[PDB]
UniProtKB/TrEMBL annotation:
Belongs to the CRISPR-associated Csm4 family. It comes from the Bacteria. This is CRISPR system Cms protein Csm4. Residues 207-296 form the Csm4 C-terminal domain. The keyword RNA-binding applies. Keywords: Antiviral defense, RNA-binding. It comes from Streptococcus thermophilus. GO terms for biological process: defense response to virus. The gene is csm. One of its GO terms (molecular function) is RNA binding. Pfam families: Csm4_C, RAMPs.
RNA sequence: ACGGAAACCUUGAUUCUAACGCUACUUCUAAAUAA
């Protein structure tokens, strides 16, 4: 709600479920887990947990940043009320395919897209796969996909200006983010910027109008029905093997279905720092699904 | 408590075998006319 944390990447691998896949942007659960792990290994885990449990804490999904804050395509607003055209069906299907292919809009034209304007994607990163082997038994051949950014494209996240969070970010920029961090993939350089004046007035947490979630958030049971009864959304799985130092064997942490970004809702709701630890294991796994909204027209 | 942790695109392999810078060739020819 306060800052515009930008992070310049050169090579990163954010898995989509398999090691051979690599998404362009990471979700908020990945960065929250990275921060929690950094605080735990440094020693100040409880301070970060107390800050996260407070309602002032905020975190959003990674979004592209290329000479201007970019944002998620609003799911459910190509609405025909502003998309009615007299063109033939060939152009109608071409523009529908172009809209479906679009994944990230620029902040300068977000309202323009809500008016019915059409935009295209931009060169951000190339998803390349490199094959490596294990020459210790000479019977291994694995493949890792990466997301080497260029065109001076960085990633940005929106978090509060806090000394703890800034310190954890600065410690994380030499620890990498996601993937084979101790193999080259994941490293980044941190910078801290102020939110542009065209974003801070709309980046919100509470009104009753239509608000795009900017985070993979899961409402509590109190307002879930009201969320989906008049909402447009997408579902993502936060499954995986829970990285932990207190087991000799990896355990599949509990699957979780979360509302992606940008899911549009008729009102704001409350998130959850949900425990997804397997039964009978002292330290838990925290999945951050807490909303940061965007006010729309 | 990051679909994460551990993995060298590594092991050996001569741009190598054959092939005359070779063939014919005198550092040599002409002495007029005048006295």
């Amino acid at each position: 709600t306060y800052k515009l944390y930008i992070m310049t990447f050169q090579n990163a691998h954010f898995g989509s479920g398999t090691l051979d896949s690599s998404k362009l942007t990471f979700s908020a659960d990945r960065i929250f887990s990275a921060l929690v792990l950094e605080a735990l290994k440094m020693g100040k885990l409880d301070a970060f947990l107390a800050e996260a449990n407070q309602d002032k804490f905020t975190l959003t999904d990674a979004f592209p940043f290329q000479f201007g804050p970019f944002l998620p395509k609003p799911i459910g607003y190509p609405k025909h009320d502003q998309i009615d055209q007299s063109v033939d069906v060939k152009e109608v299907r071409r523009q529908a395919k172009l809209s479906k292919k679009l994944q990230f809009l620029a902040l300068e034209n977000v309202d323009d897209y809500l008016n019915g304007e059409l935009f295209e994607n931009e060169e951000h990163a190339v998803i390349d796969t490199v094959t490596k082997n294990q020459p210790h038994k000479d019977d291994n051949l694995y493949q890792v996909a990466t997301t080497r950014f260029s065109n001076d494209t960085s990633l940005y996240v929106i978090a509060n200006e806090s000394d703890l969070l800034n310190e954890l970010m600065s410690s994380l920029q030499y620890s990498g983010l996601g993937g084979k961090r101790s193999s080259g993939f994941g490293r980044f350089e941190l910078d801290i910027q102020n939110i542009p004046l065209e974003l801070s007035d709309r980046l919100t947490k509470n009104h009753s109008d239509k608000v795009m979630s900017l985070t993979t958030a899961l409402p509590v049971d109190a307002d879930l029905e009201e969320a989906m009864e008049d909402g447009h959304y997408l579902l993502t799985k936060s499954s995986g093997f829970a990285f932990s130092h207190a087991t000799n064997e990896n355990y599949r942490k509990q699957d979780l279905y979360k509302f992606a970004s940008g899911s549009t809702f008729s009102k704001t709701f409350e998130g959850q720092i949900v425990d997804v630890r397997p039964l009978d294991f002292p330290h838990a796994v925290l999945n951050y699904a807490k909303p940061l909204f965007f006010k729309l027209e």
